Enzyme design. Structure first.
Site, PDB file in Angstrom:
ATOM      1  N   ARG A   1       1.882   1.043   6.244  1.00  0.00           N
ATOM      2  CA  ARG A   1       2.587   1.721   7.245  1.00  0.00           C
ATOM      3  C   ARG A   1       3.424   0.792   7.804  1.00  0.00           C
ATOM      4  NH1 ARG A   1      -2.069   4.888  10.033  1.00  0.00           N
ATOM      5  NH2 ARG A   1      -3.206   3.312   9.262  1.00  0.00           N
TER       6      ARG A   1
ATOM      7  N   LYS B   1     -12.145   2.815  -4.057  1.00  0.00           N
ATOM      8  CA  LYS B   1     -13.642   2.637  -3.357  1.00  0.00           C
ATOM      9  C   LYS B   1     -14.648   3.346  -4.027  1.00  0.00           C
ATOM     10  CE  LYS B   1     -11.463   1.655   1.248  1.00  0.00           C
ATOM     11  NZ  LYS B   1     -10.075   1.668   0.902  1.00  0.00           N
TER      12      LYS B   1
ATOM     13  N   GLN C   1      -8.039   2.014  12.791  1.00  0.00           N
ATOM     14  CA  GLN C   1      -7.344   0.930  12.040  1.00  0.00           C
ATOM     15  C   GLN C   1      -7.004   0.043  13.008  1.00  0.00           C
ATOM     16  OE1 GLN C   1      -7.242  -0.758   9.740  1.00  0.00           O
ATOM     17  NE2 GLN C   1      -5.471  -0.401   8.335  1.00  0.00           N
TER      18      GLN C   1
ATOM     19  N   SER D   1       1.012  -1.234   0.173  1.00  0.00           N
ATOM     20  CA  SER D   1      -0.013  -0.019  -0.168  1.00  0.00           C
ATOM     21  C   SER D   1       0.769   1.203   0.281  1.00  0.00           C
ATOM     22  CB  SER D   1      -0.865  -0.126   1.243  1.00  0.00           C
ATOM     23  OG  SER D   1      -1.901   0.979   1.023  1.00  0.00           O
TER      24      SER D   1
ATOM     25  N   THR E   1     -22.495   7.455 -12.463  1.00  0.00           N
ATOM     26  CA  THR E   1     -21.366   8.298 -11.796  1.00  0.00           C
ATOM     27  C   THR E   1     -20.061   7.594 -11.802  1.00  0.00           C
ATOM     28  OG1 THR E   1     -22.920   9.586 -10.311  1.00  0.00           O
ATOM     29  CG2 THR E   1     -20.562   9.540  -9.826  1.00  0.00           C
TER      30      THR E   1
ATOM     31  N   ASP F   1     -20.914   4.782  -5.590  1.00  0.00           N
ATOM     32  CA  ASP F   1     -21.812   5.754  -6.154  1.00  0.00           C
ATOM     33  C   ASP F   1     -22.621   4.808  -6.938  1.00  0.00           C
ATOM     34  OD1 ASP F   1     -23.011   8.336  -7.001  1.00  0.00           O
ATOM     35  OD2 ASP F   1     -20.912   9.274  -6.344  1.00  0.00           O
TER      36      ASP F   1
HETATM   37  O1  LIG Z   1     -10.651  -2.088   4.959  1.00  0.00           O
HETATM   38  C1  LIG Z   1     -10.037  -1.369   4.310  1.00  0.00           C
HETATM   39  N1  LIG Z   1      -8.909  -1.039   5.051  1.00  0.00           N
HETATM   40  C2  LIG Z   1      -7.816  -0.507   4.812  1.00  0.00           C
HETATM   41  O2  LIG Z   1      -6.898  -0.166   5.507  1.00  0.00           O
HETATM   42  N2  LIG Z   1      -7.628  -0.083   3.534  1.00  0.00           N
HETATM   43  C3  LIG Z   1      -6.534   0.797   2.958  1.00  0.00           C
HETATM   44  O3  LIG Z   1      -5.289  -0.289   3.180  1.00  0.00           O
HETATM   45  C4  LIG Z   1      -4.418   0.632   3.445  1.00  0.00           C
HETATM   46  C5  LIG Z   1      -3.981   0.179   5.023  1.00  0.00           C
HETATM   47  O4  LIG Z   1      -2.669   0.956   5.380  1.00  0.00           O
HETATM   48  P1  LIG Z   1      -1.932   0.648   6.671  1.00  0.00           P
HETATM   49  O5  LIG Z   1      -0.904   1.752   6.774  1.00  0.00           O
HETATM   50  O6  LIG Z   1      -1.234  -0.680   6.615  1.00  0.00           O
HETATM   51  O7  LIG Z   1      -2.966   0.647   7.911  1.00  0.00           O
HETATM   52  C6  LIG Z   1      -4.766   2.116   3.579  1.00  0.00           C
HETATM   53  O8  LIG Z   1      -4.399   2.554   2.131  1.00  0.00           O
HETATM   54  C7  LIG Z   1      -6.215   2.014   3.514  1.00  0.00           C
HETATM   55  O9  LIG Z   1      -6.867   2.993   2.728  1.00  0.00           O
HETATM   56  C8  LIG Z   1      -8.570  -0.387   2.689  1.00  0.00           C
HETATM   57  C9  LIG Z   1      -9.757  -1.030   3.103  1.00  0.00           C
HETATM   58  F1  LIG Z   1     -10.833  -1.076   2.230  1.00  0.00           F
HETATM   59  O1  LIG Z   2     -27.467   7.903  -3.078  1.00  0.00           O
HETATM   60  C1  LIG Z   2     -26.821   8.778  -4.045  1.00  0.00           C
HETATM   61  N1  LIG Z   2     -27.481   8.962  -5.095  1.00  0.00           N
HETATM   62  C2  LIG Z   2     -27.233   9.786  -6.079  1.00  0.00           C
HETATM   63  O2  LIG Z   2     -27.578   9.771  -7.123  1.00  0.00           O
HETATM   64  N2  LIG Z   2     -25.834  10.694  -5.702  1.00  0.00           N
HETATM   65  C3  LIG Z   2     -25.331  11.353  -6.913  1.00  0.00           C
HETATM   66  O3  LIG Z   2     -26.458  12.501  -6.937  1.00  0.00           O
HETATM   67  C4  LIG Z   2     -26.484  12.566  -8.437  1.00  0.00           C
HETATM   68  C5  LIG Z   2     -27.562  12.198  -8.990  1.00  0.00           C
HETATM   69  O4  LIG Z   2     -27.505  12.676 -10.228  1.00  0.00           O
HETATM   70  P1  LIG Z   2     -28.801  12.481 -11.291  1.00  0.00           P
HETATM   71  O5  LIG Z   2     -28.486  12.870 -12.616  1.00  0.00           O
HETATM   72  O6  LIG Z   2     -29.980  13.179 -10.875  1.00  0.00           O
HETATM   73  O7  LIG Z   2     -29.442  11.088 -11.183  1.00  0.00           O
HETATM   74  C6  LIG Z   2     -25.240  12.010  -8.924  1.00  0.00           C
HETATM   75  O8  LIG Z   2     -24.055  12.998  -8.945  1.00  0.00           O
HETATM   76  C7  LIG Z   2     -24.907  10.864  -7.978  1.00  0.00           C
HETATM   77  O9  LIG Z   2     -23.462  10.626  -8.001  1.00  0.00           O
HETATM   78  C8  LIG Z   2     -25.165  10.338  -4.646  1.00  0.00           C
HETATM   79  C9  LIG Z   2     -25.710   9.538  -3.763  1.00  0.00           C
HETATM   80  F1  LIG Z   2     -25.290   9.310  -2.194  1.00  0.00           F
END
Ligand SMILES: O=c1[nH]c(=O)n([C@@H]2O[C@H](COP(=O)(O)O)[C@@H](O)[C@H]2O)cc1F
Ligand SMILES: O=c1[nH]c(=O)n([C@@H]2O[C@H](COP(=O)(O)O)[C@@H](O)[C@H]2O)cc1F
Lengths: 257, 257
Positions: free
Chosen positions: B229, B92, B208, B35, B99, B95
């Site tokens: 880390r 991650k 974490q 990471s 989107t 949406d």
């Molecule tokens: O559940 C999760 N836990 C995480 O820690 N991560 C990522 O893994 C990495 C963990 O880094 P660490 O420094 O070993 O704690 C960090 O980039 C997080 O955003 C992702 C996830 F989806």
């Molecule tokens: O539950 C959700 N639904 C969504 O549609 N959105 C955002 O609102 C916007 C909806 O756009 P629409 O064009 O009116 O469907 C779009 O930017 C989505 O990413 C966010 C959320 F968290």
């Protein structure tokens, strides 16, 4: 019982960003958040300028802007200040706290430097909020927690939604409300913003589902409608925005009585 | 019963990206994903070059790179090809489908152009996968679904986890595995990648939680450890990577018998 947006702006526990928002909602008679889902900065800015008077908020997805720069965001801020709307970056932070704090402050986008509001998924647990807070509190920013989603198959239901509400209510110095499809908190200091809104029934081909402003504001008790394509895809985006504004505002008034 | 990574690489239903990964894991005797949580491109690249031989995968958060450019990603690809590792952007996506497809393909980062793997939260429902797929399938990319998280208070448990597994198993042309803390699918075609890994017990100040490679690979049945880390903060990041590699690889071997 229920209070106007202007009165909510004054509640003892109101967050300053929420208060600013509620005040401009009341002043401008708008509870419309434009979802400016465009890929060109010029279009973003031209929409922000033209629709600014009609909106309380402009929601961004900076990560779809092909020509993002921080100067674009400066220009957006100028428009936000001129027309009085907040900028909400719909980033959906959704990582451990240590990661999200960096994603919020840093990188190319420097989101915290320009976004009044961001949002977060609650799936990681409250560390997501704690991490964001470390950046956002000093910058006087607010956050929205995603308690419900508009899309088909959403898992943000039931106990998940309840967890989002708890997490908000326990982090009220930074969390100012929710993305939700309905009122989920009984505490009037929290904002409810609802996406998945169009005047007409329907949905898209990738799981989006629509409900009307009257349903969402009027029946489901939310505060603000977030509208993307219903406005953006229309020919006359200003008129579309006005239709949505009037719809959401009247729904709010009527629910207020 | 259980198959080696090399044999899993050949399974009838294996995704090509999973197969490539499994093959290089076997060849290099590594089930370590670095990471690379750094903010400087030069550090990213210097880590990728030095640690490349020790890793099966390098996980990015491009949105924390202060000096991101697409040319940095070109250079990272060169290293990935040289040393044989996949690039996983831990974006991650979380949406609605409409989107996320834009967030995956477009914007400044053009993630789909360089990331072999991305991940998604399952909270929006399967439209998140469908949207990503529209970009990722033509680009021959893979996706990981976040079935469990490592952080305190994670809501990715129980029925949520089960939903993630179902969603993966139903979108196997694009979904190649999971972020999880343990084996969550019984289907050997899916990869399990586990973050929250350190040799020593502990956790950070923002939720974490850490478990060891032996616990995660050996007892909990996961495939790959994701380590930030524990490596990045060490003085000698190469030696740290080697410690983690050896730990995860032996845990895998011993579980295989
Ligand atoms: O559940 C999760 N836990 C995480 O820690 N991560 C990522 O893994 C990495 C963990 O880094 P660490 O420094 O070993 O704690 C960090 O980039 C997080 O955003 C992702 C996830 F989806
Ligand atoms: O539950 C959700 N639904 C969504 O549609 N959105 C955002 O609102 C916007 C909806 O756009 P629409 O064009 O009116 O469907 C779009 O930017 C989505 O990413 C966010 C959320 F968290």
């Amino acid at each position: 019982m229920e209070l106007s947006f202007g009165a909510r702006a004054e509640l003892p526990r109101i967050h300053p960003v929420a208060s600013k928002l509620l005040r401009l909602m009341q002043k401008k008679e708008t509870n419309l958040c434009l979802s400016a889902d465009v890929s060109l900065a010029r279009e973003l800015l031209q929409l922000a300028d033209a629709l600014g008077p009609s909106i309380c908020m402009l929601k961004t997805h900076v990560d779809i802007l092909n020509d993002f720069t921080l100067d674009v965001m400066k220009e957006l801020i100028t428009l936000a200040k001129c027309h009085e709307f907040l900028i909400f970056e719909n980033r959906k932070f959704a990582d451990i706290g240590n990661t999200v704090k960096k994603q919020y402050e840093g990188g190319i986008f420097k989101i915290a430097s320009w976004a009044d509001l961001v949002n977060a998924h609650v799936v990681p647990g409250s560390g997501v909020v704690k991490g964001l807070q470390e950046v956002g509190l000093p910058l006087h920013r607010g956050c929205l927690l995603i308690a419900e989603m508009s899309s088909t198959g959403s898992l943000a239901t039931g106990d998940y939604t309840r967890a989002a509400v708890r997490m908000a209510e326990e982090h009220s110095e930074f969390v100012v409300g929710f993305i939700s499809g309905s009122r989920v908190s009984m505490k009037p200091e929290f904002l409810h913003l609802t996406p998945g809104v169009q005047l007409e029934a329907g949905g898209d081909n990738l799981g989006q589902q629509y409900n009307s402003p009257q349903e969402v504001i009027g029946k489901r008790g939310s505060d603000i409608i977030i509208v993307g394509r219903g406005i953006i895809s229309a020919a006359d985006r200003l008129e579309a925005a006005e239709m949505y504004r009037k719809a959401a505002w009247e729904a709010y008034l009527s629910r207020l009585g």
